[PDB]
A paper describes a structure:
In this work, we set out to find the physiological substrate of the cofactor-independent racemase (predicted DapF, FN1732) from F. nucleatum ATCC 25586, and were surprised to find that this enzyme functions as a histidine racemase (HisR). Here, we characterize this enzyme as a histidine racemase (HisR), and found that catalytic turnover is ∼10,000× faster with L-histidine than with L,L-lanthionine. The rate of HisR was not affected by buffer composition (PO4 or Tris), ions (SO42−, Mg2+, and EDTA), or the PLP inhibitor hydroxylamine; however, the enzyme activity was hindered by iodoacetamide and Hg2+, which are known inhibitors of enzymes with catalytic thiols.
To confirm this, we used site-directed mutagenesis to generate HisR mutants C67S and C209S. Catalytic turnover of these mutants was greatly reduced with D- and L-histidine compared to the WT enzyme, as expected. Mutation of an active site cysteine to serine is a common strategy to aid crystallization of cofactor-independent epimerases and racemases, and likely aids the process because this mutation slows catalysis and helps to keep the enzyme in the open conformation. In the asymmetric unit of C67S, there are two back-to-back dimers, while the asymmetric unit of C209S has one dimer and two monomers. Structures of C67S and C209S HisR were very similar, with a backbone r.m.s.d. of 0.493 Å by aligning α-carbons of 260 residues, and each adopt a DapF-like fold. In each structure, a sulfate (mutant C67S) or a phosphate (mutant C209S) is found in the active site directly between catalytic residues. Catalytic residues 67 and 209 reside at the N-terminal ends of central α-helices 2 and 4, allowing for stabilization of the negative charge formed on cysteine thiolates by helix dipoles during the reaction.
Residue numbers in the entry:
A (entry chain B): 4 to 265
B (entry chain A): 4 to 109, 111 to 264
Amino acid sequence: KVQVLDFIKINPAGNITILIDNFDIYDKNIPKLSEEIMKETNLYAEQVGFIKDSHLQMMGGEFCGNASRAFASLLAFRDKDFSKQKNYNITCSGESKVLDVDVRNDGAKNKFLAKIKMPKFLSLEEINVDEYKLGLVRFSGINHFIFNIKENKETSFENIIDLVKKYLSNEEYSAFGIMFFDSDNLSMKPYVYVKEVGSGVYENSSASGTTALGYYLKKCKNLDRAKIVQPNGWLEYIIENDEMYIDGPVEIIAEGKIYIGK
Amino acid sequence: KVQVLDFIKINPAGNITILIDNFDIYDKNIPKLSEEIMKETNLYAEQVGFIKDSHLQMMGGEFCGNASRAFASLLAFRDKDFSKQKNYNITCSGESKVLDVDVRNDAKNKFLAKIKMPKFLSLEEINVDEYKLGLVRFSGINHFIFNIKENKETSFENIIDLVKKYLSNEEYSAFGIMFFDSDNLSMKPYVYVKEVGSGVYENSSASGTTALGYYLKKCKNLDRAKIVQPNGWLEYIIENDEMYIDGPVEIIAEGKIYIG
């Protein structure tokens, strides 16, 4: 049997997102479904969501700032009343608060700029393990470590990953991120690890990571706003009225039907 | 039936230690016995350790720099070859490495004992809520550092409830909070054990004094300082990438104790 699903492919700052539509968000087939979708042998993406009215049910039931930005940019794309700017109220899995996204046109009708209010950090640390100084911005769900390659000495990105892993060996964590940060170019190579899957992936973008880097830059350099270049995209962290926002580009790539093997 | 044990009550920097001599260090009743000895209705102590030939076995198999300092000062007290200084190589539970203690005279029952202390795993500076806390993490304990003067007005209990919140997601056996006064270079060591669900403001803490020493080496580049504690004082000394604790030890009493 062949399953046909409405899809929208989107590039939110490089974190490619497939947004399935007109589907049951509670379907237990969501995880395996999104798994086959994301393959390079299929509609290749880095995140998969499931739209319904104004709610975004991610594949993992978690909150994603980029997939939420992609979603809000779809409403504008599909809203006949949208002109050049509009605020779109949306809800997202893993976030009880209603998210008000400021969606602006970025030139074309498929290009957008989406500013979303990102969760607040629980704590901000500066750990000194081994011979390296590392940042840490603990969140509800993700621990985001920072690594100023410049301030630190020579090392493989792998070494800093095994060092952070050994650091959390006594800490019940489900996933951590490490932001290998270059201060000369304000660039950042986000990395993420998960225990359940037991692997690591270098991502093209990271809304939450950019938030972490922003928190660590406001404490260490008093930068309230800046654009963070990332592998295949860029984001901008914004601290206004003691609150964190992420702004960045969003491009509607494709629209149509996908054929999955049940 | 009543147990008769030989005891030496000592005052290591205020961390009252009863050392029980001529006893099976492998006895499984040691826990209960120590519990009963430490009561204020009995001999009274903050730590209890049992002694074989140059070996010191804590009640909980832990390492205690102060109790080990007391043990070394006892050997000097009972050694007629001891003068203004002698080095005694002792061992302590929870620490395989042999420990060279520099025991000196301070009276015949007053001493000064310098012992090498465990190395830290990582040093940090958390910024949770609106507080800046230091955190030195050792093997088995995590010593927080709360600079009262550099932080804002707060209750001690507040910082305790806060630190607990920080470790909610972390698996730990116990944590100490070194409430630090930068002006007088004094601190009020506190210690919580989730394994026993209770907190105690100690008269002194050796491990805590190393934590603050590590924290003061990174922040102010201080190698050695005297840290006054509620009822005692210890001196941390960092030399050649090693941590030491010096301080006063007084032999209080010798004799026999009776336990049922």
